[PDB]
Amino acid sequence: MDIDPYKEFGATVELLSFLPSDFFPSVRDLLDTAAALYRDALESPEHCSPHHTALRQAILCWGDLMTLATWVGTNLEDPASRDLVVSYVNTNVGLKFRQLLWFHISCLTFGRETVLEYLVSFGVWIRTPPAYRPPNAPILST
Amino acid sequence: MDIDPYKEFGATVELLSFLPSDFFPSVRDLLDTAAALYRDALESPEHCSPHHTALRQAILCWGDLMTLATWVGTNLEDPASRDLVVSYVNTNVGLKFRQLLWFHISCLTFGRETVLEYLVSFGVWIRTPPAYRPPNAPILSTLPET
Amino acid sequence: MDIDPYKEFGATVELLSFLPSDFFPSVRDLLDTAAALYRDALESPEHCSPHHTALRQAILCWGDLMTLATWVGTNLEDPASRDLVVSYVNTNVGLKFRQLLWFHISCLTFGRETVLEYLVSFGVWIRTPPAYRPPNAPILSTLPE
Amino acid sequence: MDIDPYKEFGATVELLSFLPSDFFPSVRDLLDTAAALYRDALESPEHCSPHHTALRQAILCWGDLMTLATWVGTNLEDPASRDLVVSYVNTNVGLKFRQLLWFHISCLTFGRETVLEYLVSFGVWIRTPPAYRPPNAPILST
Amino acid sequence: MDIDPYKEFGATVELLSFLPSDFFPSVRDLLDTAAALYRDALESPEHCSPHHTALRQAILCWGDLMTLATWVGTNLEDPASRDLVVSYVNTNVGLKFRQLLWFHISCLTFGRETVLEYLVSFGVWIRTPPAYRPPNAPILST
Amino acid sequence: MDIDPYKEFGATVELLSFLPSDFFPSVRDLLDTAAALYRDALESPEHCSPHHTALRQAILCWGDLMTLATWVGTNLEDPASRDLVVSYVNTNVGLKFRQLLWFHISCLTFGRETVLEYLVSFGVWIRTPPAYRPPNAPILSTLPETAAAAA
Amino acid sequence: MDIDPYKEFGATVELLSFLPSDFFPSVRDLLDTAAALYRDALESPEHCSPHHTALRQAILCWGDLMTLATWVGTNLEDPASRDLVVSYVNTNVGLKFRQLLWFHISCLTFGRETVLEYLVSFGVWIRTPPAYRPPNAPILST
Amino acid sequence: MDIDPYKEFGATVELLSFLPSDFFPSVRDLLDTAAALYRDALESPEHCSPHHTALRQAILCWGDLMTLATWVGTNLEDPASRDLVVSYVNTNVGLKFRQLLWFHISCLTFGRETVLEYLVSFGVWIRTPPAYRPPNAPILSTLPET
Amino acid sequence: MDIDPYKEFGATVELLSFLPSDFFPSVRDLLDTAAALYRDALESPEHCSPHHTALRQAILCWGDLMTLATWVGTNLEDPASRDLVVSYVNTNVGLKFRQLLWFHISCLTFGRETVLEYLVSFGVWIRTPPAYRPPNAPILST
Amino acid sequence: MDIDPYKEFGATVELLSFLPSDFFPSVRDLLDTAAALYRDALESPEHCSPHHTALRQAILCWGDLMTLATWVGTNLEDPASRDLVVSYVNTNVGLKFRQLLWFHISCLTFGRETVLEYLVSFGVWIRTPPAYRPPNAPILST
Amino acid sequence: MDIDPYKEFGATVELLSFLPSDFFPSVRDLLDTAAALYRDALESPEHCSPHHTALRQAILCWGDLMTLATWVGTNLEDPASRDLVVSYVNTNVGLKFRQLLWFHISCLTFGRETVLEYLVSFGVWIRTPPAYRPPNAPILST
Amino acid sequence: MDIDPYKEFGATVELLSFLPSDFFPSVRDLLDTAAALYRDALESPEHCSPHHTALRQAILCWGDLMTLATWVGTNLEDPASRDLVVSYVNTNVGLKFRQLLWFHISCLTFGRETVLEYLVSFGVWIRTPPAYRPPNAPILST
């Protein structure tokens, strides 16, 4: 099964894989900034743009998953199951939601083409050895 | 925060909350029908309508959840914990995902207006107690069948 | 006084008398649908129709009643008295508010004339003895079937 | 000296008796419906239709019978005669008043064109064995 | 209900109470002339006015009470209950039916205006003491 | 004598022979509906249609047969003769009277052509074995317009 | 009820009762003459006159009665009961069929007006005392 | 001498084999419905259409077989052979005459195209397994009491 | 039922009965001619003329007779009954099939009117005495 | 589901609560005024403005509370809870009912915007100390 | 290489997976129907539709497989090998060939769009629960 | 029942019977070239020519046969069945599918009429004995 939501937006999973793991901000920060900056748009009952529709469903799923995590932590009996599962819910799938939400927020704030250019720039910058590339990573901003 | 995902489409969780279980086909069946019918449309790099994007996001979420469930099943040793968590996932979250997918298919195949009208009619029908409620449930389907 | 809110809409308490008690559904099933179907209209500052104004007044009155019920549950110690009072207010006047909400909601959604037609049809249906009446009791539905 | 009040209308006593007794609902239901629907028309000083007048004298006649029943129940001593009279009044002429009130009210609400076709196809549908007639009884409805 | 059927015809019982009882004719003799004048008209399916319908319905109720009388005479033995019932029927219902029939027959035969004027004149006549009221009671006629 | 009373209107004895027993209403029910429906037409002195005169003659015949049944019931002593005769008269030709009266009534009310169409509808549907006969039979009285359907 | 099949054709049972019994010759001869003269017209699928269709049902009824008579004759054991039943078929109800057959055949073959004239002539002829009446009874002829 | 009588109407003997045997109605009932549906037409001296003449000759040879059967039943001696021959003629030849008669009656009364439609509909219906086929088998009926 | 195939073609069984037996050729001698002359026409799916359809039905019923005969000959055990039945079927109804085939084949080949003329001529010729009939028999030929 | 009904008329509860309590005349005065001045207006089946509908709903709640108080007084036993809940209902929601009733009555009788101006003016004035303000509280009047 | 014959018709093999097996009729019935309906068309030398050619190769390789089955069953000595092979080829390959034949035949008879509509409707029907679906399984007919 | 696909294409097995065995190339030698030349054409949803569909279904049937044979041979332990079945399938019907593939490919690539001429010339060439047959076997090419 090969399904790619970024395909409609012009990007692809492997292209997004150029960016390495675990440098993203915490998903909680992403939610906080989106609320502080996109509170009105999300609450609107009209499809203001394609990105809002996906982000809404992603946020709902993230909330339900966090509720599942807290409920299992509060109700399961043994310590091994509880710590293993609560650590698991924030291990790999959390990275998935984190990267998806980062992509949607960045594209909404700047634009898909700018995000693709930043992706390619980061890929070229990271591919080279550290001994030659500059010590400042590319920064997404206007 | 507080967001109603169905609100963009005009419906609400409370409106669908009238819908009881046993009028939603199983999630696996929704996957089967969606993959069989709308595969070319879904895989397209053009967003033809918000329904497709929402459906795709739900499909990804459900697939990830099933991956989580099988991963837990492979490793957990305590039968009670693993069976309890898998049942929880299949009954609580499964209900929500199944409701959403059914709503998306119904809206896409039958149209927005028809689905909302049928939902209001069903809500009116379900509230009346059995003593005065007609026994023939309203059913809308693509079949010219009586 | 002898004042009937239904009297100026064309309906009447005696006319609504056809529907027997226990027919109307739970109040919460009225509140949830009213909210999730006319939230903006109720919250809007425009009195489009008297139905909305009556529904707003009923909402406030019922909320006040429930606040009083929670108060008496929270403060008083006499258990039998509090149970009797909450039961009385929840069952007796609750029925009146419930039918009020049902009437206005149906009139708004389907039309007052259709509501009156449905009332007379239900009266005809219910008066007939069980031995001859069909099981298909009349029901309004913007949907065909 | 042969008088049938239905004679001025299209119906006839034997034709209206075509339907089986016990199908007409209790008299209290008829009176309550008639009140709730036509209090103003009955109280009006105008004769908008002969049906209203016929119903008016029907109501007065029934009230006289009810007063007779109340008086006989109040004064007389023999329980045998009392129960005999009350049962006879409640059952025998009760049927006639029920039929009369039902006819007038139904004709007014739905018109003669529907009542004189509801007295046919019903009482006819009853005769047919429950194996070739339509599954359910017909109902003057809306 | 609170129905005064006379109010439809313009009069009311309060006004009609001017005529004191014992100045009305016997029911049998009144029915005699009513029939002799409008037999076919009552029996016809044509309804020229509410008077005919009311007369028909009143005749029907009178026949019902006669049926009750013959039933009770045929069944019961004791004389007290029987003759008390007969007295009640001839007293309460008798006066009301007799005045109703007289009013309707008179207004149909001569008109509503003449009969109303007659009631007014009879009232003003009967108010005055006998010492001054003329000894020829007013009579509606040709 | 080769006489076909139905052949005047097109039908035949052996065509209506299709209609199954325990289908027609009892004769008394037919009398109650016919008198209650066409009282004046039957009582009228005008040959408005052959159906009316046919029904009138059948009514007279049935009245005479009932008079005979009452006579045999109230007079004869032998119980065996009594019950044999009454059962015979009630079952054998009373069924024929039921048949004729119902057919005439349906023709007059529903129209003659429709009656023949419904007759052939049974003639086909009833002829099928139960393994292929649907359990939903061709109803004729469209009068009630279904009065709504069941399930 | 009282229904007269001769009512439609202009005659009435009251008038037709003038003719005394033994006047109508016999069922067998009526059937024979009907076969000899008008047999074919019965089978035509067009009703040329109301007499033909009524004659059809009269013949069917008489055949049914003959079958009933012979069948009951073959099965009953008590000779007295069977003999009495056979006596009944030609006594009461056979006379009715003979009367109907005579009326219809005469009306068809000579004509209705001539039939009525013959009835009236026989009525005037019979009443007169035998000592003065002529011995040549009226008979319809061509 | 390889002749298929149904061939010129557009039907075929093997195509007609779709309808299972024992479904076709009794010979006597088809005979007496044909009688009091087409007495005049069969009796007429005009060859209106091949339907009527084919029916004429079919019923003729069927009556000839019936006469032979009764003659042998009356005349021959041993019961076993007589009964065996009667059953043979009534079951085997009776079936073919029955199907011939049914096809002609149905096509004449309702038309050939209607008969073809009914045949193909019944084929698609019967091929369906019982667990999935509905119990509402098709029946041609100019009566629209559907 | 009284059904005669010859009636539609204008002939009758009584007419063909005029031709004596022993002249009509064996059924096989006609089947061979029909095959060898009109195999293509018979096998065609076209209802060219009623003659062809009638011949087809005749051939089918004949073949069913033949199948029955061979079946009984092979299966039945009693030689006497077998011989009796085969002789009966072969001789009695064989004459009828011979008449049918001869009539249809001749009418198709030369024309129905010509065939009828041939039948009448042959009948009158055979009826004629030898002293006066022409010295040669009448034979049908091209 | 928090609602401020005055928002659709234009005002807000906080604007109304800006004014002090115990200023409006007792509830009975308002009820007597409303009755005596608008009996026919409220009893009429015409809804002139939302004022009347709101007033009628207020009267319905007021009657419900009165019947509840009578019930609790007659049925419950302990005086302490009785009087306590009586005082609670009379002070807490009684104030709101009185405020709403007075507002609607005054706005109906004298005007909406003028009543709003009176409210704001008196609210600002009462907070104003006795410095540059007349020693007579503003009084609303025609 | 990946080949999907339905993709030439616009459908897909996976799409056909809705209809659960135990629905596709036995191969023999499909072959009998195809022959009975299109004998001459299949034997024809003209390509009147692609469906005809496709069904032609379907029948051809089906016949080759049947020859394989009969050959291996007749020739081999070991029972397990032969019966296992025949059973497997009858069940697994039989399913695919049967569904291919049914699709071709139905599409040719009714039309491609009608077959697609029937397939999708049946799928939807069987997916849903009972109380939410009509009780009549869809069935295509012309 | 029996179909010759080549008749639809104008040829016959008898015509191709001229081509001897062990003359067609290997199955792979045709399949690989057919793929390399018409992969996009076959994969397209458009049926440009019947040859393409026939080739597609031939490849499907052959691939299913090969898959089944390989799977069963991998399962079964007996060597006789495995080797004999492999040889049989690769020999007889393998040759048949090979010849069909070659025919369709040649007709597609050089043109059907050219194929017919080449086969005719090949037959004429091969008939003659080798003593006079030239050593340059006719070959179809550009």
Numbering used by the authors:
A (entry chain A), D (entry chain I), E (entry chain J), G (entry chain G), I (entry chain E), J (entry chain K), ...: 1 to 142
B (entry chain B), H (entry chain F): 1 to 146
C (entry chain L): 1 to 145
F (entry chain H): 1 to 151
The authors write:
The HBV core (or capsid) protein (Cp) is 183 residues-long with an all-helix N-terminal assembly domain (residues 1–149) and the C-terminal nucleic acid-binding domain (residues 150–183). Cp forms a stable homodimer, where 90 or 120 Cp dimers assemble to form T = 3 or T = 4 icosahedral capsids, respectively, with the T = 4 complex the predominant (∼95%) assembly product. The icosahedral T = 4 HBV capsid has 5-fold, and quasi-6-fold (icosahedral 2-fold) vertices, where the 5-fold is composed of 5 A subunits and the quasi-6-fold has a B-C-D-B-C-D repeat. DNA-containing and empty HBV capsids are trafficked to the nucleus by a complex of importins α and β (Impα and Impβ) to deposit the viral genome or core protein.
To examine structural changes of the Impβ-capsid heterocomplex, focused reconstruction of the quasi-6-fold regions (also referred to as hexamers) of the capsid was implemented. To perform focused reconstruction, we used the particle coordinates of the I2 density map from the high Impβ sample since these complexes were geometrically defined and biochemically had the best chances of having their quasi-6-fold sites occupied. The capsid particle coordinates were symmetry expanded so that all 30 hexamers were independently included. The six “symmetric” classes were pooled together to produce a 4.0 Å hexamer map. A hexamer model was flexibly fit into the final density map. We found that quaternary structure changed at both interdimer contacts and at intradimer contacts. When dimers were aligned on the basis of the two copies of helix 3 at the dimer interface, part of the four-helix bundle at the intradimer interface, we observe that helix 5 of each monomer has rotated so that the Cα for residue 131 in the loop is displaced by 4.5 to 5.3 Å (5.0 ± 0.4 Å). In contrast, the focused Impβ-bound hexamer reconstruction has a pore diameter of 9.75 Å, expanded more than 1.5σ beyond the simulation mean of 7.60 Å (orange). In the focused hexamer, the CTD density of 1 B monomer allowed the model to be extended by five alanines beyond Thr146, the last residue with a defined side chain. With the C terminus extended to residue 151, the B CTD was long enough to exit the capsid.
